[PDB]
Amino acid sequence: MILPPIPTPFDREGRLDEEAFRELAQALEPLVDGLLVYGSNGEGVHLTPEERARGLRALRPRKPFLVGLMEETLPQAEGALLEAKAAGAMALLATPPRYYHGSLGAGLLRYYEALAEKMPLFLYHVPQNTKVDLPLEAVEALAPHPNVLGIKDSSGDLSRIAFYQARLQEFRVYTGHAPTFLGALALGAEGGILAAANLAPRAYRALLDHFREGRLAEAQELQKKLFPLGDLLAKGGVPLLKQALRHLGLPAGYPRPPYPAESPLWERFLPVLEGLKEEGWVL
Amino acid sequence: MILPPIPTPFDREGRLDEEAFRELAQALEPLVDGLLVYGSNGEGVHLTPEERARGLRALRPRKPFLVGLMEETLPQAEGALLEAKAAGAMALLATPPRYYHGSLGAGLLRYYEALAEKMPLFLYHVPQNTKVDLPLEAVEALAPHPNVLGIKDSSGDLSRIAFYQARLQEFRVYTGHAPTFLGALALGAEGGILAAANLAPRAYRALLDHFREGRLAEAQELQKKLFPLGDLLAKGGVPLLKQALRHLGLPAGYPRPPYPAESPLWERFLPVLEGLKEEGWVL
Amino acid sequence: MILPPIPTPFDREGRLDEEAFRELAQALEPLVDGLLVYGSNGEGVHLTPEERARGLRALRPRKPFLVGLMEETLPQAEGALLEAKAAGAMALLATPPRYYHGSLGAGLLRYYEALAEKMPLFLYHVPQNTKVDLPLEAVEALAPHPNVLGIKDSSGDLSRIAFYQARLQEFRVYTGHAPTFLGALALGAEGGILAAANLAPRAYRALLDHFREGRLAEAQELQKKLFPLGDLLAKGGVPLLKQALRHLGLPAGYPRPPYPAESPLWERFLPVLEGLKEEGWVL
Amino acid sequence: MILPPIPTPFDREGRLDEEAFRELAQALEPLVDGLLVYGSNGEGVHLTPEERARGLRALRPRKPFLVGLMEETLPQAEGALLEAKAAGAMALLATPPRYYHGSLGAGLLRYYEALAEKMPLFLYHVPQNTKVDLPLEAVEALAPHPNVLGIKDSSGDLSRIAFYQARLQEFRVYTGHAPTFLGALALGAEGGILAAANLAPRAYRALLDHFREGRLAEAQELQKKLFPLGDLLAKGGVPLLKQALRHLGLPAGYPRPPYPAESPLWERFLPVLEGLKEEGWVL
Ligand SMILES: [K+]
Ligand SMILES: [K+]
Ligand SMILES: [K+]
Ligand SMILES: [K+]
- The span from the CA of A1 to the CA of A185, in Å, is 11
The continuous run of DSSP H or E covering A173 comes out as strand A172-175
Compute and round to an integer the Cα radius of gyration of chain C: 18
Going by the annotation, the residues of the binding site of B are 193
Q: Tell which A residues from 113 to 132 touch B, by Cβ distance under 8 Å.
A: 114, 128-132
Distance CA B199, CA C109 (A): 56
Three-point CA angle C124, C128, C133, nearest 5°: 55
Cis peptide before D258 (omega within 30 of 0): yes
Asked if B186 has any chain D CB less than 8 Å from its own CB, the reply is yes
Among residues D139, D213, D191, the alpha carbon closest in space to that of D169 is found at D139
Q: What is the DSSP letter of B10?
A: B
Residue D235 CB-half CA count within 13 A: 13
CA–CA separation, D213 vs A205, rounded Å?
Answer: 74
CB contacts, 8 Å: C211 with chain A: 216
| Strands ordered across the beta sheet of B2-3 | B2-3, B191-193, B172-175, B148-153, B121-125, B91-94, B66-69, B36-37, B5-6
Alpha-carbon distance of B149 to B143, in angstroms, equals 8
Q: Is B23 exposed, middle or buried (0-12, 13-18, 19+ CB in 10 A)?
A: middle
The one-letter amino acid at C142? L
Strands A2-3 and C148-153: unpaired
DSSP letters, D84-97, are: HHHHT-SEEEEPPP
The Cα–Cα gap between A139 and A164 comes to 9
Residue A6 · residue A42 · CB < 8 Å: yes
Chains that touch B (3 or more CB pairs under 8 A): A, D
C160 at interface of D, judged by CB pairs closer than 8 A: no
Q: Is A260 on the interface with B (CB under 8 A)?
A: yes
B163 touching D, CB under 8 A? yes
Question: D14: Cβ–Cβ under 8 A, 6 or more apart, which residues?
Answer: C73, C74, C75, D256, D257
CA distance B32 to chain A (A): 26
- DSSP state letters, B73-123: SHHHHHHHHHHHHHHT-SEEEEPPP-TTGGGTTTHHHHHHHHHHHHS-EEE
CA dist D107 and C238 (Å) reads 14
Helix (H, G, I), strand (E, B) or coil at C275: helix
Closest in A179, A211, A216 to C162, CB measured: A179
Cβ neighbourhood burial of D71 (10 Å; 0-12, 13-18, 19+): buried
Cβ contact, residue pair B158, D166, below 8 Å = no
The number of CA neighbours under 13 Å toward the Cβ of A93 is: 28
H or E, element range at A219: helix A216-247
Q: Which residues from D are below 8 Å from C258, CB to CB? A: 73-74, 97, 104, 107-108, 110-111, 114
Instruction: Return the residue in C157, C173, C187 with the most chain A beta carbons within 10 A, the one to mutate for interface testing.
Output: C187
Active site residues of A: 124, 152
CB D115 within 8 A of CB D145: no
Name the residue among B80, B77, B96, B78 with its Cα closest to residue B37.
B80
Collapsing DSSP states into helix, strand and coil, what is residue B153? strand
Instruction: Please say whether the beta carbons of B111 and B74 come within 8 A.
Output: yes
Looking at residue D173, the DSSP 8-state letter turns out to be E
- How far apart (Å, rounded) are the C-alpha atoms in residues B234 and A129? 24
> Which residue of C13, C103, C242 is the best one to mutate when testing the D interface, meaning the one whose CB has the most D CBs within 10 A?
C103
CA distances from A198 to A21, A103, A203, B143 (A): 13, 37, 11, 41
Q: Which residues of D touch C111 (CB under 8 A)?
A: 258
Asked whether the beta carbons of A96 and A104 are under 8 A apart, the reply is yes
Between CA B200 and CA C173 the distance in angstroms is 60
Name residue C37's beta-bridge partners: C6, C67
**Among candidates C156, C211, C220 on the partner chain, residue whose Cβ is nearest the Cβ of A159:** C156
Region of residue C188 (phi > 0: left; psi between -120 and 50: alpha; otherwise: beta): left
Question: Would you give the end-to-end CA distance of chain C in angstroms?
Answer: 16
Q: Is C124 noted as a catalytic residue in this protein? A: yes
Question: How many angstroms is the resolution?
Answer: 2.1
Q: Could you tell me the distance, in angstroms and rounded to a whole number, from the CA of residue D139 to the centre of ligand 4?
A: 10
| Interchain CB contact of C107 with A (< 8 Å) | no
Query: Measured between alpha carbons, how far is D237 from D229 in angstroms, rounded to an integer?
Result: 12
For chain D, list the strands marked E by DSSP: 2-3, 5-6, 36-37, 66-69, 91-94, 121-125, 148-153, 172-175, 191-193
- State which H helix or E strand residue A151 sits in: strand A148-153
Cβ within 8 Å, pair C158-A162: no
Sheet holding A172-175, edge to edge: A2-3, A191-193, A172-175, A148-153, A121-125, A91-94, A66-69, A36-37, A5-6
Half-sphere exposure of D3 (CA within 13 A, CB side): 27
The 10 Å CB-count burial string (b at 16+, else e) for A188-215 is bbebbbbbbbbbbbebbbbbbebbeeeb
Looking at the CA of C143, name the nearest ligand.
3
Q: DSSP letters of B198-210?
A: GT-HHHHHHHHHH
Burial per residue of A142-174, b for 16 or more beta-carbon CB atoms within 10 angstroms, e otherwise: bbebebbbbbbbbbbbbbbbbbbbbbbeebbbb
Angle between helices B266-278 and B216-247 (to 10 degrees): 120
Query: Among B221, B258, B215, which Cα is nearest to B239's?
Result: B258
- D232: closest CA of chain B, how far (Å): 12
User: Radius of gyration of chain A from Cα atoms?
Assistant: 18
Contacts of residue A267, Cβ cutoff 8 Å, sequence gap at least 6: none
Give the three-state DSSP class for D153. strand
Q: Are the Cβ atoms of C259 and D100 closer than 8 angstroms?
A: yes
Question: What is the DSSP annotation of C189-242?
Answer: --EEE-GGGGT-HHHHHHHHHHHHTT-HHHHHHHHHHHHHHHHHHHHHHHHHHH
Instruction: Give D-chain residues touching C74 at CB under 8 angstroms.
Output: 14, 256-258
CB-nearest partner of B111 from A105, A237, A258? A258
Residue D202's CB: how many other CB atoms inside 10 A? 15
Q: What are phi and psi of A122, to 5 degrees?
A: -115, 145
Classify burial at D32, counting beta carbons within 10 Å of its beta carbon; exposed 0-12, middle 13-18, buried 19 or more: buried
Round the CA-based radius of gyration of chain B to a whole number and report it. Answer: 18
Using alpha carbons only, give the angle B129, B164, B230 rounded to the nearest 5 degrees. Answer: 45
Q: Which of D124, D164, D204, D254 is catalytic?
A: D124
Residue C49's CB: how many other CB atoms inside 10 A? Answer: 15
Q: How many Å apart are CA A107 and CA A122, to the nearest integer?
A: 17
Distance CA B10, CA B257 (A): 9
Judging by DSSP bridges, how do beta strands B36-37 and B66-69 pair with one another? parallel
Residues A112 and A120: their CA atoms lie apart, in Å, by 10
Experimental technique behind these coordinates: X-ray
Question: What span, in angstroms and rounded, lies between the C-alpha atoms of B260 and C21?
Answer: 55
For residue A234, give the nearest of A190, A259, A197 by alpha carbon.
Answer: A197
What Å distances lie between residue C182 and A55, A152, B227, C188, C212, CA to CA? 42, 20, 51, 10, 11
Ligand 4 centre from D197 Cα, in Å?
26
> Residue B124 catalytic?
yes
- Touch of B by C (3+ CB pairs closer than 8 Å): no
**Residue from the list C163, C166, C180 with its beta carbon closest to the beta carbon of A162:** C180
The CA A102 to ligand 1 mean position distance, Å, reads 26
Alpha helices in A45-91 (DSSP H): 49-57, 74-87
Q: Which residues are CB-neighbours of A278 under 8 A, at least 6 positions away?
A: none
Tell whether B109 is within 8 A of chain D (Cβ).
no
Q: Among B175, B207, B204, B199, which Cα is nearest to B189's?
A: B175
Identify from D137, D177, D180 which residue to disrupt to test chain B contact, counting B C-beta atoms within 10 A and taking the largest count: D180
Cβ neighbours of A278 (radius 10 Å): 9
Contact A216, C216 (CB under 8 A): yes
The one-character DSSP state at D73 is S
Residues C241, C41 contacting (CB under 8 angstroms): yes
Residues with CB under 5 A from ligand 3 (ion): C 148, 170
SS3 category, D158: helix
Query: Is A11 an 8 Å CB contact of chain B?
Result: no
Phi, psi for residue D246 in degrees, rounded to 5: -60, -40
- The C36-37 sheet, strands edge to edge: C2-3, C191-193, C172-175, C148-153, C121-125, C91-94, C66-69, C36-37, C5-6
D210 φ, ψ (degrees, to nearest 5): -55, -45
SS3 C153: strand
For the CA atoms of C148, C150, C156, C161, what is the dihedral angle to 10 degrees?
Answer: 120
Positive/negative CA dihedral, B122, B126, B127, B132: negative
Determine contact, residues B94/B124, Cβ cutoff 8 Å.
yes
Closest by Cβ to D14, choosing from C73, C104, C108: C73
* Residues C257, D110: C-beta atoms closer than 8 Å: yes
In our burial notation (b when 16+ CB lie closer than 10 A, e otherwise), range A240-265 reads bbbbbbbbeebbbbbbbbbbbeebeb
Q: For residue C17, give the nearest of C227, C220, C235, C255 by alpha carbon.
A: C255
CB contact under 8 A, D45 and C238: no
Catalytic residue among B38, B124, B174, B254: B124
Contact A223 C185 (CB under 8 A): no
Residue A175 near residue A181, CB atoms below 8 Å: yes
Q: Do chains D and B touch (3 or more CB pairs under 8 A)?
A: yes
CATH number at residue B64: 3.20.20.70
**Which residues face D69 on adjacent strands?**
D94
Q: Which residues of A touch B106 (CB under 8 A)?
A: 260
Q: Which helix (H) or strand (E) holds A93?
A: strand A91-94
Contacting residues for B281 by C-beta, under 8 A, at least 6 apart: B200, B202, B203, B225
**Residue ranges making up the domain that contains A216:** 2-283
CB D43 within 8 A of CB D73: no
D172-175 and D148-153 as β-strands: parallel, antiparallel, unpaired? parallel
Q: Could you tell me if B176 and B160 are in contact, meaning their C-beta atoms sit under 8 angstroms apart?
A: no
**D20-59 residues touching C, CB cutoff 8 A:** 43, 45-50
CA distance C36 to C18: 16
Q: Considering only CA atoms, which of A166, A164, A141 is closest in space to residue A152?
A: A164
What single-letter amino acid sits at A130? T
Angstroms from A158 CA to nearest CA on chain C:
6
- Torsion from C-alpha of D228, D229, D233, D234, nearest 10 degrees: -50
Query: Which stretches of chain B are DSSP H helices?
Result: 18-28, 49-57, 74-87, 107-118, 127-130, 136-142, 158-167, 181-186, 201-212, 216-247, 266-278
Q: How many domains does chain D have?
A: 1
